[PDB]
Write a protein that binds this ligand. Structure first.
Ligand SMILES: NC(=O)c1ccc[n+]([C@@H]2O[C@H](COP(=O)([O-])OP(=O)(O)OC[C@H]3O[C@@H](n4cnc5c(N)ncnc54)[C@H](O)[C@@H]3O)[C@@H](O)[C@H]2O)c1
Ligand SMILES: NC(=O)c1ccc[n+]([C@@H]2O[C@H](COP(=O)([O-])OP(=O)(O)OC[C@H]3O[C@@H](n4cnc5c(N)ncnc54)[C@H](O)[C@@H]3O)[C@@H](O)[C@H]2O)c1
Ligand SMILES: NC(=O)c1ccc[n+]([C@@H]2O[C@H](COP(=O)([O-])OP(=O)(O)OC[C@H]3O[C@@H](n4cnc5c(N)ncnc54)[C@H](O)[C@@H]3O)[C@@H](O)[C@H]2O)c1
Ligand SMILES: NC(=O)c1ccc[n+]([C@@H]2O[C@H](COP(=O)([O-])OP(=O)(O)OC[C@H]3O[C@@H](n4cnc5c(N)ncnc54)[C@H](O)[C@@H]3O)[C@@H](O)[C@H]2O)c1
Ligand SMILES: O[C@H]1[C@H](O)[C@@H](O)[C@H](O)[C@@H](O)[C@H]1O
Lengths: 339, 339, 339, 339
């Protein structure tokens, strides 16, 4: 039997999740939608040929007793309240990142979900589902390179829109690494420091520093060095290297396109779209959520606790962006509810 | 509508197709299976959690009116009779390659299908659906390397089962390249020659020559040199290089796993089976079949005609296997039914 | 103590050898030169600031008692006579390839050398000294991939000059693979066959077929497939893959230049010059010869007998070029003098 | 003419330089040696078949008027006094790194050299002669990736001797990157900071932190992140990546050895010896020195001023090692003498 889904927020990513649920993946149907732009909601039903109700708001959607799960894909600042409303129902909840735009909001969601008899929230950190990143983590966990001492990573994007701010370097971009590293390493963060190399001439946006260097430390002492470079021009690329006691692991060459020998060069195309880079991870992530719902079991993907960790770390990083000083992080031990 | 599927042959690939139809793809349910090994059939039903009938043979399964489409996934030599029996029904038919193991068998199938009012057979030539191979073809077709003069290909398997015969080097293995190159180049064959290099000590099957070299020539004069090496030990690999007038195109190494630096080496894993190497291609081809069946429309993928055309060249190769002499090929034009 | 060298032929490669001997390598001095173009010879003296005598011909140069070794770097057709004269002296002899332009010439040399008390000839087949090619042979010889069954190789050149003939595809280009493969495999050839794929539109030379496919068979059964492509446009490239019973070996990409990420591509440069490609090999080869002469020991590089094997094989290939048919090769057993 | 050389310090590197000068490179002869271990010097003479005088100390050796140049290859701490003595002579001076073990000693040398009628000192920072590193610099200097924003580098070593100390992570290992980067970027340093990640279990030496992270900043604002890992086990490796405004450049994998397909992996060998890694650079660096001396021209390699920059920066690094705090660097303008 089919997992009946409501979607709250039918913009870009909302529509892409609808497409996933409707066209790409198995076992679900979108039967309700809402958007504060009623017209956007109506277009979704129309464009994807859904047999679905358009609700005027989130509150009314959430009272529909036939909806098994909700996807929250509205503006980030709007997640917190909506998630708290859905927690007054029994529905499963897939929220895109962030769990909340403040760490205070995140803690509320955590505290409330912790009052429930079982976990219902999955947060949209898709990196964990990417085949390559997953395969590296698995290899690391065999012990073949010993303990992880240093991690070096890059988050490379070709160009940004007019609306991209200095803070979004953290909240939209580094956030992926923020969720990824503690999971990768099975460790907790103790600090974050953002430093600014010389400013790129390619930056067109007021207040945006690019590139940015993020250094994180963990409780076991692993140091993580992330390069964030969002006006890099050449392509979209995610790089990851783990330095171990006895060896190293890194992500392979990405891409399926051919190797061209021509005009005194050998070359391969580089991905230009993060959308395309992570198509697989999005599919895998959402299919897993649906599969869990379908058997009336809690999600096994990133949780509200993960969302809270990310929120705390992002806020520490936003603080660090002001003065380039190291900010400490102390995250509480995970409630057993979240293991 | 959800397509109700029967699967005939529930070995390695039968199982993989059941898995994908059940857990990954959309719009299908496996409702019946059969295998000459009843235990294998029962194992498939249980391992994939099916509510499926287990029929004692193909003929009984084919006479179940509730089945919309059948998958023929038995030993290659068994496809011919099963496909012919299925053509006595109104079911859609997906057969794995080869269409048959002889030219005469393939021709029987085409002759019978031509008596029907619409086309119902798709053949599992999945290479055409592989994203990398498609990307190479599309780049070739831009003209960037000029005309294709030579193609070099490898079809590498680590080992074979005890039932793998010399003839199967062509009908089970080379058949992929036989179909592929004529699609890739939009050209047809004028000859094939099989030669036998130094026999590997790794061969364990009586009568099997390994490796084998296949030289195919096309009408436009492109020469294709295929290496078939099915006891290679190291891994499963498909390699493709197109030599043009002004450049070259090559398929990249396939791999998701990490690069490991350890013990005086830098290494990456190689796939050990088709099952994972071509998972995308199998998913795509099968989804397309199911989507067509759902509309009660003929398949748009490779046809029994493509199967026959390949069988002509395969039969030529099997003839060449006897004396290592070149065998001429001149295939008939595509009948209107198959255009 | 310094090996005194005379150079016979002071053209492009003659000058390059002079340069090596004078400015790059250790233990030698060019004290005499000759060229049928006297002006070229004088120029070589001035240009390399030599303390050397210019002789009118090879005969007179060869009478200088102070010369320990001669370099034969004239037109290929001139090698035979000069090498035969030099064998009337006790001097060591480095001849560039070919040993002789006919097989009968090569045999005359071998027969004459066999009367001497020690071996004095090294032939300039430099591939054997290329570090990459050597490293591959070495790894092969460890047994790690088992016995070599098939060799796939490419000799890629961007364009040719107007003097380049069909037969030069063998005598100037394939000759390197002809010397290389029997050495690589510790084997003897039994046949060669040249075939012509579709003719490239890039060919501008009368009578030239390009590309050419060369297939060689060996006594142990290994099949060698070489692609010769001399109007390839994109670069100069030497490729080598050995298919073994239990694994494969291939040369890596040549070049030390950086990997560039730019403009939606990842790229490395491709060499356009065979000269640049084989700088190291030429240096290593000549240094070895000099080092042997310095000890008054026989050269240990490719011998007149290797020159003979090359000549017989090349002749067979030029024969095959007429009709694309296989031509047998039965090389006599190696004389103990050459073992 | 032949450059007559004296060598001070005939240990591992001094013997390696003697070997270069005698058996590999052109244009030099070792005619004098000294070592505080007299038996080591005598042994160098025997082992390399030198026609050389053994002197009991540096002072005595420096009085041989037949010596055109001296090589200083003693303990680092002995370089300063010896170089200063040598500057009272007219001989040219090749000193292995470091110029001096204190910045004050380096200044003394600089100050003294500045009084002379020509520059005579070259310092053994061989990285600048490495073909791959040079090719990367050259490409960077074309402007193709825009301005350099960040540099990421690794200095990876398998294991260290029992006498390797924490400070040697800087003075023996990071010193190479210290000289390299300011040259690479044509910039000057403004700061250095050494941080200590998780301590490796592979460390056997009391007080040694491994790995170590070094962050250098430059006047133009480029940030350099170096990973120093000297108990890495797997191999010896130098990595370099330059992140530009519009692209990236990175050094390719080192090695000419083959790609092996075997045992479910594709692999290439990793160098285990620093010696073999930089053999080319050592040869080139020394040949260039000898070629300059042959002409009575000043060296064009790394100078005493480069030695001073390195000593200042190393000193700052050793200071940073105490508390992991950033240390400023402000080197004086380069004297015209050293331009
Ligand atoms: N990689 C990822 O995981 C990833 C990628 C893209 C976007 N996202 C996240 O998805 C969310 C949406 O991003 P987007 O790119 O689609 O933005 P968007 O602006 O296109 O779409 C958001 C939609 O939400 C609607 N909306 C806003 N507030 C609402 C409310 N309270 N209730 C209902 N609807 C509301 C808007 O009208 C709009 O239609 C954001 O949280 C974004 O961070 C995540
Ligand atoms: N397209 C591809 O890449 C790909 C990959 C693997 C296999 N195949 C094809 O799939 C088919 C099956 O191969 P496999 O690897 O699964 O082999 P397998 O040996 O694992 O399984 C074959 C199954 O067929 C059963 N069988 C044999 N004859 C039968 C008959 N008359 N009726 C019913 N069942 C019968 C056997 O008992 C066995 O269970 C072959 O045609 C093979 O060429 C294609
Ligand atoms: N091993 C290699 O890779 C390689 C590379 C280049 C050339 N070669 C060989 O080197 C030889 C010379 O080639 P090149 O490119 O220098 O050609 P070139 O034409 O530049 O020079 C040849 C020189 O030989 C002189 N010469 C001709 N006949 C002579 C004779 N009887 N005595 C003395 N001098 C004579 C010519 O006047 C000319 O100066 C050829 O055999 C060529 O095949 C080998
Ligand atoms: N550039 C490079 O990459 C590189 C590599 C290795 C060594 N080096 C440098 O080479 C120098 C030597 O290192 P090594 O590995 O050969 O060490 P080593 O200990 O093997 O040899 C040093 C030699 O110097 C002798 N010696 C010590 N003090 C002396 C003095 N006052 N006068 C004369 N001789 C003296 C010692 O007896 C010994 O024989 C060091 O400065 C080292 O840092 C540079
Ligand atoms: O049946 C399989 C299948 O066709 C594979 O794709 C091929 O690689 C194997 O050689 C063959 O035995």
């Amino acid at each position: 039997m089919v997992v009946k889904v409501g979607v709250i927020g039918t913009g870009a990513m909302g529509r892409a999740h609808i497409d996933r649920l409707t066209n790409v993946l198995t076992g679900a149907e979108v039967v309700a939608v809402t958007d504060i732009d009623h017209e956007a909601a109506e277009a979704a039903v129309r464009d994807f040929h859904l047999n679905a109700k358009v609700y005027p708001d989130d509150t009314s959607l959430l009272q529909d007793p036939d909806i098994d799960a909700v996807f929250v894909v509205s503006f980030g600042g709007a997640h917190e309240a909506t998630v708290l409303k859905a927690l007054d129902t029994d529905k499963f909840i897939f929220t895109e990142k962030p769990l909340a735009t403040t760490l205070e909001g995140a803690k509320r969601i955590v505290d409330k979900e912790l009052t429930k008899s079982k976990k219902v929230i999955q947060v949209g950190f898709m990196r964990r589902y990417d085949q390559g990143i997953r395969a590296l983590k698995e290899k690391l966990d065999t012990g073949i390179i010993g303990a992880p001492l240093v991690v070096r990573a890059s988050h490379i994007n070709p160009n940004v829109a007019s609306n991209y701010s200095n803070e979004m370097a953290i909240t939209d971009t580094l956030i992926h690494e923020i969720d990824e590293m503690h999971w990768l390493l099975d460790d907790e963060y103790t600090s974050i420091q953002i430093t600014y190399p010389r400013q790129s001439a390619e930056v067109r946006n007021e207040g945006l520093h690019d590139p940015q260097l993020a250094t994180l430390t963990t409780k076991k002492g692993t140091v993580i060095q992330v390069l964030v470079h969002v006006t890099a021009q050449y392509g979209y690329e995610v790089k990851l290297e783990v330095i171990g006691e006895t060896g190293e692991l890194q992500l392979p060459n990405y891409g399926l396109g051919p190797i061209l020998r021509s005009n005194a060069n050998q070359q391969t195309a580089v991905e230009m779209s993060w959308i395309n880079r992570f198509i697989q991870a999005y599919n895998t992530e959402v299919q897993e959520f649906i599969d869990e719902v379908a058997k009336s079991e809690p999600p096994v993907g990133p949780s509200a606790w993960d969302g809270y960790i990310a929120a705390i770390t992002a806020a520490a990083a936003n603080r660090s962006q002001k003065d380039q000083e190291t900010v400490l992080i102390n995250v509480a031990g995970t409630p057993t509810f979240y293991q």
